[PDB]
């Protein structure tokens, strides 16, 4: 298969600091974008997306334009307390109405300790 592993179930990060959510693709196929969400279900919010917009408070950890890229790790900056939540790295596949959810990483609970 292609497997989406998020190896950290938690990350404990200081308020105002940068948080890295690790996510790695074991293989490149099927072709299609990566997408970071907060929560599961319909009210999951879209936190990053390869193919869409710019996201002001999200750099990406690796250069995505490079060819055999399999790291999809994100850096949310200026983490505020209400950035706590569960984040899910999700592979979508190619479609026609297009880009259907293929596989989700098992999740990375974020938590902000207000600390100097």
């Amino acid at each position, epitope marked *: 298969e292609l497997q989406v592993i998020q190896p950290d179930k938690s990350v404990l990060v200081a308020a105002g600091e940068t948080a890295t959510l690790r996510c790695t693709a074991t293989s490149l196929i099927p072709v299609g974008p990566i997408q970071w969400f907060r*929560g*599961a279900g319909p*009210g999951r919010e879209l936190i990053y997306n390869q193919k869409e917009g710019h996201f002001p408070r999200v750099t990406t950890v690796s250069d995505l334009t490079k060819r055999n890229n399999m790291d999809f790790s994100i850096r949310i900056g200026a983490i505020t307390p209400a950035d706590a939540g569960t984040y899910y790295c999700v592979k979508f596949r190619k479609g026609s*109405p297009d880009d259907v959810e293929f596989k989700s990483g098992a999740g990375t609970e974020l938590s902000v300790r207000a600390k100097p």
Partner: antibody
Framework: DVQLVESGGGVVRPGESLTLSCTASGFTFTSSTMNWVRQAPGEGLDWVSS????????YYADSVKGRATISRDNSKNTLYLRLFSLRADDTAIYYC???????WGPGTLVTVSS | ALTQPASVSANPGETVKITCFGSSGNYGWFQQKSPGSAPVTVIHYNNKRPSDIPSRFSGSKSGSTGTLTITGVRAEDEAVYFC?????????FGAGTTLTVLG
């Protein structure tokens, strides 16, 4: 354990407004999405609305878009649903459900009637 | 949009599959013993079984289709089963698959 307790159920007069509550325990409400689904007695489940962790994104079903507000209050682990200009159509048992519909409230029967 | 079988009949001890399509999203299967009584999730997010629910219940997504598999159906699995699917931004349910055990 997870426990969901709806309330607000009863009769409301057609064309008027009413709010459902749902209290949640046994899980991390803040870090969790929420939905409302309803079921006209002896008919099918119908999605009504969803809400994000934060509360800033709300989604709604054509059922009720415009004339419902879904809301949450994480400070007291409670989820809401004001419903406006109530119709015979809307008479239903209304269930809150977590996240990916993994746990369900016992439901609260709302009857639109004069 | 979701179509699912209006009813399927099965003999005890046998392996029934109900399937559901109409969505590109993730699928859940919700049990309902009787009209009125609350739904109980037998599978969510395609293939996750709650700790509670017994192991004869298994879920799969392939293509844009969901399949609930009861392996060794029992008298107490006799119920109504609704598939539902969600994407980011929306959810939907099927019209319900009433299952009865022969015998």
């Amino acid at each position: 354990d997870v426990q969901l307790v709806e309330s607000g159920g009863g009769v409301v007069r057609p064309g008027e407004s009413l709010t459902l509550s749902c209290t949640a325990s046994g899980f991390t409400f803040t870090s969790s999405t929420m939905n409302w689904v309803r079921q006209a007695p002896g008919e099918g489940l119908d999605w009504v609305s969803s809400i994000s962790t934060s509360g800033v994104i709300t989604y709604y079903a054509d059922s009720v878009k415009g004339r419902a507000t879904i809301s949450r209050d994480n400070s007291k682990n409670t989820l809401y649903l004001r419903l406006f200009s109530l119709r015979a159509d809307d008479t239903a048992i209304y269930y809150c459900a977590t996240d990916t519909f993994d746990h369900w409230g016992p439901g609260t029967l709302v009857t639109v009637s004069s | 949009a979701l179509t699912q079988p209006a009813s399927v009949s099965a003999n005890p001890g046998e392996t029934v599959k109900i399937t559901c399509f109409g969505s590109s999203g993730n699928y859940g299967w919700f049990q309902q013993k009787s009209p009125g009584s609350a739904p109980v999730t037998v599978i969510h997010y395609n293939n996750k079984r709650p700790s509670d629910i017994p192991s004869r219940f298994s879920g799969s997504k392939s293509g844009s289709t969901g399949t609930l598999t009861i392996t060794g159906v029992r008298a107490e699995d006799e119920a109504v089963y609704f598939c539902g699917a969600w994407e980011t931004g929306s959810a939907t349910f099927g019209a319900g698959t009433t299952l009865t055990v022969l015998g």
